[PDB]
């Protein structure tokens, strides 16, 4: 195994400085394999950022975002970094790590290992978490479900009893209101007989205002 | 940008060329683009390496090439397991690399399938505090366009509604979804209401009441 895993704050205000983070597994972060960032502006296509050459620390960037960032990599955590100054409403992206494959010549364009992504916002408004309602059945005729309310900014993560379900599981993609705040909703599919005999229950995680609740859909 | 057509489309077990134009100083100096394929809401995955080389694990279906100042992707034997946003990205001068546009490959003549609709009231949970949302789920449809309308009482609602840009899940059909937003007195004021969602023509309802 090889992982990446990107962290960093999702909600970043106009003019700040905005970084990320990616942990590595399984490999020396010296071992020379240009640690990349890219970026997804969401439905608008990928933007390469810039990357670390392993085993020099030397860093190259985008000629758009040079004169504004660096990016560096930490021998003591073993992990890489994206700093990114005077942040602006266009910087709100998805933002993935990378690793470029060994020993290629421009490996930064060969990217074998990505991370997960991680959506962050640039705005000016605040954090809001979640208000959490049960959705339970007679009216729908075997789906149990959840609703997340007005919440900001993206995203929201949800599980089922705990991660005892997968099986029958939908996540619905969130709705912008007017408001600029948005909300979602969750279901699971039910054998109907299982009503009132086995407990239903989903936990919600709302971490860019630290919201963690559970929620009884209780019959 | 590099360019590449905004859409392509192709039928089933056929084959499709997929193409990145740039200029000299990025496709044509440097014996070095790749390929990215991207389903939606996740990381992209690596295709080619090089004008020709595949990572391992990529299928034999996927073959690089490089002409001039432009370059492709070609995929054969097509699954709609190939439904996917492609994108192409080549080194360019002095340590740096440039993506493609991106573009998006529709495989055609798969089966099609209309909406599984759900459809939940306000939690009485919520309608405590005063305000009351209605929550319509639309699930496994393909094609990926739908009409959408509530009704209270049997006619017609224009305010106080939101509803999603559709959405492809895992098995390549879409969902959506639906929310009308009404105080309590808006809730209690109605003895139904219904969504009506329309598929190719065809027609769900679902329905729902106070109790």
């Known amino acids: 195994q090889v992982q990446l895993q990107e962290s960093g704050p999702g909600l970043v205000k106009p003019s700040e400085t905005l970084s990320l983070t990616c942990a590595v597994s399984?490999?020396?972060?010296?071992?020379?394999?240009?640690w990349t960032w890219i970026r997804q502006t969401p439905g608008k296509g990928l933007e390469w950022i810039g990357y670390?050459?392993?085993?020099?620390?030397?860093?190259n960037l985008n000629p758009s975002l040079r004169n504004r960032g660096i990016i560096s990599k930490d021998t003591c955590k073993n992990q890489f970094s994206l700093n990114l100054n005077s942040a602006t409403a266009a910087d709100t992206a998805v933002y993935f790590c990378?690793?470029?494959?060994?020993?290629?010549?421009?490996?930064?364009?060969?990217?074998?290992?990505w991370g997960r992504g991680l959506l962050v916002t640039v705005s000016s408004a605040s954090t809001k978490g979640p208000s959490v309602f049960p959705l339970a059945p007679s009216e729908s005729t075997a789906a149990l479900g959840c609703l997340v309310k007005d919440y900001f900014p993206e995203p929201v993560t949800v599980s089922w009893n705990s991660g005892s379900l997968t099986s029958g599981v939908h996540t619905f993609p969130a709705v912008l209101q007017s408001s600029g705040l948005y909300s979602l909703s969750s279901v699971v599919t039910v054998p109907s007989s299982s009503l009132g005999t086995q407990t239903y229950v989903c936990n919600v995680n709302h971490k860019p205002s630290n919201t963690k609740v559970d929620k009884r859909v209780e019959i | 940008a590099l360019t590449q057509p905004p859409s392509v489309s192709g039928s089933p077990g056929q084959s499709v060329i997929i193409s990145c134009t740039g200029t000299?100083?990025?496709?044509?100096?440097?014996?070095?683009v790749s390929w990215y394929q991207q389903h939606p809401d996740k990381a992209p995955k690596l295709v080619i390496y090089?004008?020709?080389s595949r990572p391992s694990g990529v299928s034999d279906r996927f073959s690089g090439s490089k002409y001039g100042d432009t370059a492709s992707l070609t995929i054969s034997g097509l699954q709609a397991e190939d439904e996917a946003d492609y994108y192409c990205?080549?080194?360019?001068?002095?340590?740096?690399?440039?993506f493609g546009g991106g573009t998006r490959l529709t495989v055609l003549g798969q089966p099609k399938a209309s909406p599984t609709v759900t459809l939940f009231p306000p939690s009485s949970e919520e309608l405590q505090a005063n305000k009351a949302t209605l929550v319509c789920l639309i699930s496994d449809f393909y094609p990926g366009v739908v009409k959408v309308a509530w009704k209270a009482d049997g006619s017609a609602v224009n305010a106080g509604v939101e509803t999603t840009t559709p959405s492809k899940q895992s098995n390549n059909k879409y969902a959506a979804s639906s929310y009308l937003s009404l105080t309590s007195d808006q809730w209690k004021s109605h003895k139904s209401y219904s969504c009506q969602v329309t598929h190719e023509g065809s027609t769900v309802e679902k329905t729902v009441a106070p109790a």
């Open positions: 090089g004008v020709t």
């Open positions: 990378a690793r470029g494959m060994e020993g290629l010549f421009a490996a930064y364009n060969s990217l074998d290992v």
């Open positions: 000299s100083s990025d496709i044509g100096q440097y014996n070095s």
């Open positions: 990205s080549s080194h360019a001068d002095e340590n740096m690399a440039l």
């Open positions: 399984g490999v020396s972060i010296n071992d020379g394999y240009d």
């Open positions: 670390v050459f392993g085993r020099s620390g030397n860093f």
